[PDB]
Structure formats: C-alpha cells, structure tokens
Subunit: 455 residues, 4 copies
C-alpha cells in the first residue's frame, strides 16, 4: 500500500504505511537501523506479547489501568500470540542494545490495535496509548530481559528437552537390540579389544542422559524474571506488589515455574543466566558432534570404509549413501560453538546498571535452541530409528583382526600367542592361518577357544 | 495454491505445489531438513545462478549444449539475478554439507523455467533437464565452492570495501578539523599527558587504513575458483579447456579478477580461502569495536560522564542521548567474533577429497560481510559525519587536571612543580590555586607558562 | 648416564634421574613448546597409582612388599620431592600414555631403591608389571584428570570465590546509604545506592557458586576400571568400586566409579560442562572488574566515584594517577578463560569411537582456568576489593549535577513545568536548583524538601 | 637479603638476585598462576633496551661509559646468563610496566657491577634515569612484542613451514602413479592418485605461507618513540627513526617506525591480524593430520592405505597397533591455536583511548601459537611425514573392491547395462568383474582392457 498515515513522537511527525499497525518510533528505527536481514525471532515476539499481557492484567488488578483498556490490550496481545500480526515487527536485531526499539514496536502495535478493538481507530487519535497505557509500570530495561527469559525457558522446556528425551529413548532401544553383537573396538583409530555394538551405543545414551541433567540445572536461573526492576533495578515508579504479581501471572499463563529475580541489579546488568545456560548447550553440541561422527564413520563405505552399520537412505554410484542427516547435525554443532563465543563476549560486556548487548545475545541463544531441538528431531526420525547392523561385515572385521589373540593365552601361553600374532602380522595372514601354519593348534581348537562373545 | 504437480526422481514421485518451479529433489529435501529458519542468502542464490549462466555459455562454446537450450538456461538464470524467483529457493542452510540440495534446487528451477521459455511446460514433460542439461560438466562438489567464492569476492569488493573507504574519509575529515583541539590523554583509564582530538581520531583513521590493506591481501585466494575439478578434483568428465574458460566467463560478466584454482584438491577439500579472509574481518571487527567504544565513552553524559564530544541524536531525561549506533555496531562486532569460531571449526573439519561443512561456513561468512558493511554505513551516516567537540567541557577537563604541571618544570624546577602537584591533589585544588597558595608564581606567569598547545 | 631399555631397545638416561626408557624416548619425540604437566595433575596421577596399589594388594594381586613401597614412592611425589622427574610436554599422545609411563617408571625406580634395590634395569619393582597392574593409560589418565579437576575446584576455586563474595557483601552493607547516579547506555540515569550497585556484584558471585556446584557430580565420576575400551576386561569385578572408594578415602572428596565407562572413556563431557560454568564466572568477573576500574577512573577527568589502593610506586610529579592494575590482571585472565573454553570444546567434540585423544590439551586448559580464576580472585580481593572506598564529595557533586532528579519535582509541579526548568538548566549549563530559582518556579527551601534523592 | 627501595619505601630482595624493589613488590602483588614472560620476549625486551642505549648515546643523552655497560648487560641476557632474573607473572599490569621495570632493574644492577660498582642502592647505573631514558612502558612493551613476534615468525615458523612443505612435495612426486579410491562425505567416490591427494596438502601449506607473509609488514611497525600517549613528548625528534634503524641493524629484520603512533599504542591490531593467518594455518594442519591418521588406521579394521613410523614401544602380543601419536600432538595444538585466537581477539577489541592494556595476555598467546606451530610442524615432519609409505596391496585391494569403476564400462556398454552388473555386484557382494562375468555381459579380457583405473 502506497497510502501513508502521519504518526508522531517527541521528535516529530513521520509517515507510516497506512496498512500497518506500528507507529512513529518503529518507523524511525526502521529507517535508522537498516543493517543486514536478521529480525527478532517469532518466539521472542510472542514472549514480549505475553509479558505485555501479564503486565496489563496486573496493572488492572492494581487499579492502574481501566478494565476496558486493559482487556483490549490483552485481546490485542492474544492475536499476536495467535500469529495474526507477525508482519508488524520489521525491526532488525542490530538496534539499540537494550531492545528499546522492539519494546516500542510492541507498544505501538498493541496500542493501535487495542484502539480499534475499542471501536477506535489506529493512528494519532487512538484510544489506547503506547507509553501511558501499554508500557505502564514498565521500562525497556526490565521488559526486554524478561521477554528474553520467557522465550528461553519455554523453548528449552517445550522444544529442546522433549526432543532430547526422544532421541535418548531411540538410542536406548538400539542399545538393547544390539547387546549381543560383538564388534572390534577402536582406540586412537587403531584396532583394539572387542565390545558389543550395544555397549558402544550405551555410551551415546549415557552422554545424552548426562546432558539432560546439566540442562535441567541451568533452568532455575533462567526462570528468574527482571520485571519490576524498571530503569536501574530499584523499582522506582511501581507498586510494591507488582514484581511478584507479574511473575505469578506469567507462571500461571505459561504453566512454567517463573519467579521474580531476587536481585534486580544482577538481572538488569547482566545476561549471566543465559551465558551459563548456553554453556550447557555447547556441551550438548560437543556430545552430539561425537555421536553424529561415530554414526557416519561406522556407516562409511559401502566397500572402502568401515561399513559396520547401515543408515536410512533418504534421497536419490550404487551403494553410495551420503550421511546427510549427520552432516546437517555436525554443521549446526559448530554453529552452537560459535554462538557461545558471541554470547560470552556480549555477557562480559555489561557496564554499570545495564547490559546493552541483549538483542545479539537472545538472537544467538534462541537460534542454538532451535538448531539443537530440530536437529535432534530430524536426526532421530530420519536416521537413528533406522540404524541397522551389517552383521556379515562386523564378523568379517572381527575375524581379520589380530586383536582376538588374547583368547589363546590361557591355552597355549603368552609367548606362543605373541608368536602367532607376529607371524600373522608380518605375513598378512589371519590369526587362524598363522596358528595352523605353525602347528600350535588344530582348527577345531581355534574355533572352540577364540569366542569373541567372552570379551 | 493447493493444487499439486507430480514430479519424480530416482527415488520415485512426489507432489510439488503447482505454482512452484522447483522439482522432486528440492521437495524431498524440504521435507527431510526442516531445521530452524536459516535459508541460503540471496547473494549466494545469485552467485549460483551466475555460475550456471557461465557454465551454460562455455558448454555452448564447446558444442556440449545446443544454442537454444543454452540460451534458454541463460535467460532463466538472468531472471533469478533480476530477483524474479527469490521465492523458489526454500531450502535451509542445515542440509547436506556439500550444498548438493541447493545445487539441485537451482538445476530444477532453471530447467522448469527454461522449458517454458522454449514454449514448453514445467514438470516431467519439460524440454530442459536439471541434470543432463543444467548441471552439464558439473558436480555439486565444484559448483557450490565456486558459488561460495563468487558471492564472497563480490560482497567484499562491492559492499564492504566501499563502505570502509567512506567511513575512513569521514574520520579523516574530522581529524583535520579538530587538529588544534588539545584534550587530556587517558591511559589505563587514568588522566595522562595531553594530545589533540585530531591526533586521537587519526589513530582511528590509521586503523581503518591498515584494515583495508589486510582485507585486500586476502582477496586473491578468494578469487580462485574450483569449477572444473568435478567430483574429487581430477576434472574427470570435462573438456580440458573448461576450467579456464568458465573462470574467464565469470570474470568477464562480473568484472572481477576470478581465476581457476591452481590446485583443485585444495579447492574442494578445504574452505581455507574463507578461513583466512574471515581472519581479516574479525580483525576489522576488533578495530571497529574499539572505535565505537571510544565514541560512546567520549560522548557519555551529559553531566556525569566524560562528555568531550556530542553525537547526532537520531531518536526521541533531557540531554540523555543513548549512543544507539555505537550499540548496534559493538553488537555486530561480537557476532563476527563468534562467526569466526564456527568458520574455523568447519574449515578444520575437512575429510579426504571434500569439505562438507560448506553451507554453514558461507552462512557465517556472508553474514559477517553484511553486518560489517551495513554497520559501517549506518554508523557513518548516522553518527560519524556529525561528531562535534564540546570545547567548553574539553577545556574544563584540561584545567582541572594535574597533568599540566609538567609545563612548570623548565621555569621553577621539578621539585617545586611536584610540590604544587602534591598540594593540589591532597587538598582538591587546581594546579593554579595550589601554585598561588604557595606563592611560587603569579597568575600572569601561570597563564603564560602552562600552554597546553605546546604538548 | 644409565642404560635403560624397552621393547624398542636400550637408551641412555641421565643417571641422576628416576625416569626410564619410555620417558627418555618421548623426551626426544615430543619436543614441542614449553608446557609440561602441571603439579596438580602430577599429584593426581600419583594418588591414582597409590590407590591402585592398595586395591591390588587387597585383592591379592600385588605383594605387600611392593605395594607398600609403591605407595611410599607416591607419597614422596605428593611431598614435592620429585618435581624434576616429569619433563614431558603436554603435546604428547592424546591419551596421556607418555605421562602414565613417566609415572610408572619414576615410581618403579624409586620403589626399588626403597626395597634396598637399585634404579635401572636391575630394579626390583617393574613399571608395567607392578605399578601399572590392572590399569591402562586409557582409564588412568581420565581418572587423574577428574581427581585433579575436582580437588582444584573444591580446594582452590570455591574457597576463593566465597571469600571474595564475603568481602563485597561487607562493602555493599557498608555503603548501603550512599546515593549515587545510575548509568544505562553509559548515560546519566536514575539514582541508586552504591550498596545496591555492589549487591549486584554479590548476587552474580552467589549465582556462579551454585552453577559451579552443579557441575561437580559429573566430574566426580571416575573411569578407573574401564580398562582399554570400557569393558573392564582383565580386571577383578570389585576393582572399579574399590579403587573409587580408596580414592574417596585418601582425598576426602566424594569420588564414585563412573556408571557408564564407555561415556567416561570416549568423551571429556564432564569437563566441557564444568568449564562452561567457569567461562560464565569469567564473564561475571570481567564485568565486576570493569565497573571497579571505570568507577575509579580519574583522578580529575573520569568518573572517580570510588578510590582503590595504590599498590605500585608512582611518579612524584604525578600524584593521583593510580592505575587499576589488579583489574587489568583480572580482565586479562578472564579473556584467557574464554579462549580456553574454545580449545576445550574443540577437543571435547573430537572423540572417535572408544576413546577421546585430546586429553592432555583439555586438562592443560581446564587446570589453567581454575588456577587463573582462583588466584585472580584472591589477588583482586586482597589487593583491591578489601580497599574499595567511596569518594563521597565526588559522588554528591555528580548527583547534584545531573538533570535526572527533575522527576521528584513532577509530583509537586506539572510534568511540563518541571521539565521546563530542566530544559533551561541543560541549555544554560546550570544546575536544577539554579534554573528552578532563576525561573522563579520555587524557592530554595521547597526545592530541597521536594528533591529528596535518598527517597529514590 | 639486600635492601632496595623505591618511592613506596624499602623492601628486601634476595642478595643473589639482580632485580630491584619494584620487581620484588610486583612478585608479592601478582602471584597469579605459573605463566611467566617467555624467553623470546625477555630477549626482545633486552634488544629494545640495547638499541635505546645506543641511540641515547649517539644523541648525547647518555654517557659512553653507562651506555656501553647497559648494552653489555643486555648481551648477557641474550646469552642466557640471566634467565632466573625474570620471575614476574604474565598476569600483571596490562601495559607490561612490571616487566619493563624488571628489565630496567636487572640491567641497571648488572651494569653497575660491570662498571666496578655494586648491585643495590649504591649502584652506579640507575634503572629509571639511565636504562629507561627517553622511554615509557607504554611504547617499550608494544615494541618488544613486535620484535619478538616478527623474529619468531621469520626465524622459527616460516623455516619449519617451508621444510614440511618440501617433504610433502617429495611424497606427492614419489606417489604420483599410485591410484587410490577417492572419498567424499566419507563414502567411496571416483579415483585419484595418492600423489594428487598429497599435492592438495602441499598447496594448502604454500597458500598459508603467502598469507603469513602478508601479515609481516604491519608487525614490523614499532611504537618506540611514541612515548606515553603517542605524541613523542620528551623525546628528540630523530629518536624514533634512529632506534627503529638500530633495531633493524642488530636483528637483521626489516623493522620500521610506526607511521601512526596512536594506532600503535591504542591497539594490538597487527597481532590480531597476524594471528588470523596462524589460526588459518592451524585449520589446514588439522585437516592434514586427520587425513594421515585416518589413512593409516588399522592395521586390519580401518582404511590402512598408508603406514607411518612406529615411534613408541609396543606390546609384544599386539604387533601392528601403531598409534598416530604425532598426529594427536599436532591436532591438539591446532585446537590450542583456535582457542588462543579468541583470547587475543577479546583483548584486541578491548583497548580504551590512548592505550590497550591487555598486552601481556595477547603476547603470551601469540608467542605460544608460533611456538606450537613451529615445533609441531618440525616434530610431525621428522617423526611422521618423512616416513609416510603406501600400503600398495591394501590400496589396490580397496580399488578393485569398489563399485565406482563401473563408470569406465559405460563408454563400452549402455548406462543401464553397465549399471546392471553394478546392481548385482552390490546386491550379491561380488566384485564388478565377478558380477560382469556372471551376468555374461563381457569376458575377463575385455573387462580388464575397458576398466583402466590409471586412466582416471
């Protein structure tokens, strides 16, 4: 739409596209921060809406906002949560470090929309006001950090954790299924003492189980909300019950254990909870990287690699099956590693009463959660559930190795066993061929003595 | 559009939305790699189109493709370059590590579209074929790395460098303008010996000038193209002149100094050129971070900070002017730092004949270029061009410091000068007040002797 | 020299040394840089060998004579009597095999002497057959890593963290009544007390402590008993539990045998996670150190709200220039911890199959981080934090110089009118009161009674 | 002990040491971890003092007697006669002031003795007045940093890089005729020669060399002469150029005075950029080391296309298990360089106004990276690369075992038909020829003549 609407702020009047619900400040920001293409994540936008919804309810309960105006704001916020206004938030991540502009973006959209809901119109003759009504009892300083934690906790609890548990379950099933399949162990990439495929997979299971607990330990700090601290953390210009009531409200509507932050100065001046929470995520990324690598190496081939297992072929060189799910997963693990550094730098850069590196920190944090959650889901349904052992190949490898010589010790002694190993190695023979060539035992004895199952 | 079109590949038939130009493989990928929200950057999409356009021309020149089919492919590619098909590339960054899926995405879109251009129809009865025609003489293995370098070099040359030179020019002008303005120096954050504001800014200028040369030194390696190496770098299934001719073609149509990579194995097995090029970018990020910090600290106030300079107020607490442009810039500098780690991990992870961490590497690389280029442009036009000195404040600081005591040495000797400094410090007086209290000199003498201009 | 040998043959070793052929050979093959195993790790490796000897004895696998001699040689290492006997670089085999053999040879040679024997090939105690009995480099090194890590965190890091917290808590309590100007985006903002600002630092440290404590249980898991690939092949069934118990006993730390030995051998997950908490602490400390040095900037042209002790001698003609040196040392080591995290992450993500072989590098970085953080907090505490003092005159001057207090006037006069005097003060360079009186909007008495900064 | 003093008073220093009061005081205030200034930096700082002494003498600012004595004391440091005289930790003042004073005191005390004087307060040569004449810690430390960095890159890193490149170039030339199976995504792909694969490693190293060379000009710029804030106040106009010339002369390196002293003092930009090239080299080396160890994996259940020398003794009952130890040491240090880059970047991005005060940490990481890379390449070269040998039987077995060669058959039979035998070979577990003959699509003779792997 070419038609414009004249909106205004303390700085003056500016043209806003008539079909849009934002106002003067969002338009100004849009024109001053034309940097790259990253915008606020949808999850953050919804968290901001939830925060405004909660603030409105509590403001009403405290007699600070009229029932009609408060309910209108609440209704407008719900539409945002329903995905009806995703096109109303054009601001880039690369804006003011406190997230003031996106806060104002939400205030303007909710004000113009709530006005219409009250039979009013959008624009300068609106019934609901962005600052006086929608931003009542708040500050960009405590609102943005709150939206950050709401989005972070819900994403961890609703997306990440469920996917982690699911992948763990699948791997545990595979572990039990292949409990009796003996294969060659590998240390330093060299042939080593045997172990079952089930034991090897149990290692991946234990890794995921440990990662779960680590992630769980980081949740309580993220559950702490800054709302109520206002500009510098002192809570100036708020009702003494506000901070507690707004935290309770958010907890009730999200069904998540949110609590008001015991120290508002720590809450506004840092991104510590997220720096720590992300620490657990980079840990999971390192674990997932190793699991994904084991899978693709073990599945390498079909003729010139290891080929101990086969994975589902999901796309259209005969047996050439590229482990694409493993590639997507390893790539995103590197991404999480890089994201941790950006977050660490932002988190260590707070100054006095406020950390102004927030949009960047939340951009990286939510991205890591999306990548990890979707990555595990994709890897699970498109790879893990279909992992199958190549029994023939596994057995062939076992029988060609020199690592089973240990079973001969108790029968013919160490010296003779080592001699057989040496001969086989120097002459390129199997242990059986060497043992028989030397005449140290019969084939029947070899077959009875070297049972990999007793590793 | 609900209506579907049945397309097919080696794996079978799959439904594709009728209004779309992609095919079976893109649809399969779309359904298997539902990970996060990051898709291929527009610049990479255009680079891929340029690569296909160049390959078509050379294939024609070598009599491998019919004039009509080749010109149709070329025309289809131009539409992509014109931005007519940005909606035809839905694939996520988190796909196969070689970028095979996006290569196929381009092949299918160009095939279906070129068919229509030849009076044909899109779909399985198309005149132009994705693999046989559009991907002729190519492999995803050498195509993707080529598209990566084309996008990288053009972005550096057309976006980044011009913006860097512009910011440098602005700062150089400011440096000359404030050449005579003496201010207090600061080391360890403590008051130190004086220097002019112009000298301080000249430091920022020299930093940017040095960064330019470093970036320029990284360009030749990025100019090397892998096209012609095919699957493993040997160039199997190509005309001996192909590699050279396709590099010349790209050079001609882009007006950039592209050359075929002297060693195709290094080109396919690594992302070394980008790892190194990004090294120069993280260097620029560190420099920009320091400049941005100096600006905001120097502009801090208006009453309780340093307040030596004032910056343009771009948005609507009276004199409270938040340095938002500085905040956006410092945030993106942290981003570039994190991106470098993701790139380093991906670059160090190649295996044998191919590095399969490419989509992730190019995602991070082009993002850093966008951030740095747009960031400098925004910071320049919305901050740097309007930097002004607060002469009154600057002079006040100079006169309140104890650092000008040095000018007294040649007149009254070191011992008396130090005594005046000590007295002023202990009693909270200015150097003049202390000197006069002691009776070591008259006010006229002080005013004549301590001339900061002779620092 | 003395001639020692192994399967590869004989090699000369300095006669005045207790190491053997394998250590001598490694000394020639891994001449990389100058980093060696830190003392804490050497001690941890010695403790691991001491525990193994005791258990092997209890299980009747090792004679009392040899077992007691080995434990005795180990105690000497712990007592700092053999620091010069571990010359191997960090940059060796990724499993730490070299350092395992270094310990086996030193302990064997010394144990022989203790038994009236000699060092060298005629030694009575054998490095592989005796000192390394029931073990493998594969499960011994990871165990040593966890023992060193857990003891360093518990004995050094945690105590220093608590001490620094207590000091800052005392300061916040002491300055609870000093109102200062708040700063957001580096700009003048609304007031808060110095005590409140410091309480923010305290809460950060308290939060970090719990985060660090959450990572200890995983680090307490020991690999010992997993043997070569985690199966425990060639070990008595009770060995793993018994040795973990023994280690818990002699160190007084809650060590337990790892529930899953495959996870224990194939990864460095416990350390990747524990270090995550450490880089978090580094980010917190960096912020605290920066606030302190910026608040102390001056003495005339910065902020100067606080003063810190002058530790280094200064120029006679430059009184007042006090460089915040402890803050510079602390921020530098914080950057180091961040870098260390990346190295650990890359090593931790790089395991293959049954064993992660990036161990020496991971433990080198981890122990360094603990060392830097523990000592850094101690130094900052004693040489800076304990001496933080407010410059009350400067603080008040700044407070009464800002236009931020105009908010109090609103409650006593229309928003626009209160803002009106602020506009003038700002425009003319006057103070809120000066402008207020000049504009005749009020009198000195009523102004002072209305603008009560202590009332937030 | 001996009693030395400074503006803060007197303090006892061990009589057998040459340092003074300021170094002794710092030793008590910065007791952080165990990292001290590396030898290369100590030498660089000594060279800087030697050059300053000469120029000051030439300008008539220092007496020939003292100037020559100072240079003599400096040469002794370079000769390794005073390594024990620099006990200061890396974690000190961010400007490196402590280490500057450490050098001033040691040089003053020793110079006095050289002049028939004594060490201590009755010394004839003064640390500040003489050794530090015309200088400041602010411009001396950055200069020492660049001298150490440029000399390390030129004398250690570059030569080792060229040597490793030459060795690998010989290998590619030697194995130019050995056809092996290519691998993409870890899957069997089309063939290439071992020589071609190795040529890829060579090209990587050659590219890295030029990238490293591009960073040298900026590192060659010296801050000396900038003085406290970069203005050069209190220095003779020709001092900066003369001292840079002197340094170029005695080191034989192309040092020049920094065109902009403000950029030189306020940042560590030259090192941030130079290190960028180093982490690039680390990424390249990591890839090379990984290829080598994976290609040598085995001896029976991996790839086993090549064999590398066995450097460490192995178990008698386990012949063939050759751990790629040099590859493990190399990949570990590559991870270290990556971590080091992050620490340097954070320090480099943290300068404020006229001076960057994260210097000791930046130089510690930078020099370590150079050391790790130079020594790592040397060790890998001599103990692994020179001995890389192909296992021709294994290579050929793998080549004739893959279905990838079916491409050659297409040119002699319809795509579908050629693919048909491939389908069977794959399905039945037969070889391309076995399936080809069993399907009767050709005879042994014509198959062998059609599938020429050497013809790519």
């Amino acid at each position: 739409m070419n038609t414009v609407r004249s909106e205004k702020d303390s700085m003056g009047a500016i043209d806003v596209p008539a079909d849009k619900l934002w106002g003067a400040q969002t338009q100004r920001s849009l024109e001053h921060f034309r940097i790259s293409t990253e915008k606020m994540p949808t999850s953050l936008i919804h968290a901001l809406a939830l925060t405004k919804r909660a603030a409105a309810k509590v403001n009403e309960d405290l007699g600070l906002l009229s029932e009609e105006k408060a309910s209108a704001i609440r209704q407008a916020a719900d539409e945002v949560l329903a995905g009806q206004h995703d096109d109303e938030f054009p601001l880039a991540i690369w804006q003011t470090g406190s997230g003031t502009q996106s806060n104002m973006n939400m205030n303007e959209v909710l004000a113009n929309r709530a006005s219409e809901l009250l039979g009013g119109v959008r624009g300068m003759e609106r019934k609901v006001h962005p600052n006086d009504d929608v931003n009542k009892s708040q500050s960009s300083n405590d609102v943005f950090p709150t939206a950050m934690h709401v989005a972070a906790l819900l994403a961890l609890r609703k997306q990440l954790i469920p996917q982690l548990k699911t992948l763990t379950q699948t791997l545990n099933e595979k572990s039990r299924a292949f409990a009796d399949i003996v294969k060659i162990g590998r240390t330093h990439l060299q042939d080593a003492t045997p172990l079952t495929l089930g034991q090897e997979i149990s290692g991946w299971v234990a890794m995921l189980e440990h990662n779960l607990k680590h992630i769980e330990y980081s949740l309580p700090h993220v559950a702490e909300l800054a709302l109520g601290g206002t500009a510098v953390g002192t809570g100036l210009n708020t009702h003494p019950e506000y901070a507690r009531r707004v935290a309770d409200e958010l907890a009730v509507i999200t069904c998540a254990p949110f609590v008001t932050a015991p120290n508002k100065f720590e809450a506004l001046a840092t991104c510590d909870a997220l720096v720590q929470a992300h620490g657990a995520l980079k840990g999971l990324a390192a674990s997932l990287m190793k699991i994904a690598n084991d899978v693709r190496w073990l599945a390498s081939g079909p003729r010139c690699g290891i080929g101990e297992i086969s994975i589902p072929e999901n796309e259209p060189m005969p047996g050439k099956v590229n482990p694409t799910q493993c590639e997507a997963l390893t790539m995103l693990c590197c991404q999480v590693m890089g994201n941790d550094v950006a977050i660490n730098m932002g988190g260590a850069s707070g100054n006095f009463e406020l950390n102004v590196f927030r949009p960047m920190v939340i951009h990286n944090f939510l991205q890591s959660v999306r990548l990890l959650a979707d990555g595990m889901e994709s890897f699970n349904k498109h790879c893990a559930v279909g992992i199958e052992p190549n029994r023939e190949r596994i057995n062939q490898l076992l029988n060609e190795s020199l690592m089973l010589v240990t079973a001969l010790n108790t029968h013919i002694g160490y010296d003779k066993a080592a001699e057989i190993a040496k001969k086989a190695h120097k002459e390129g023979l199997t242990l059986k061929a060497a043992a028989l060539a030397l005449g140290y035992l019969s084939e029947a004895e070899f077959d009875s003595w070297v049972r990999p199952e007793q590793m």
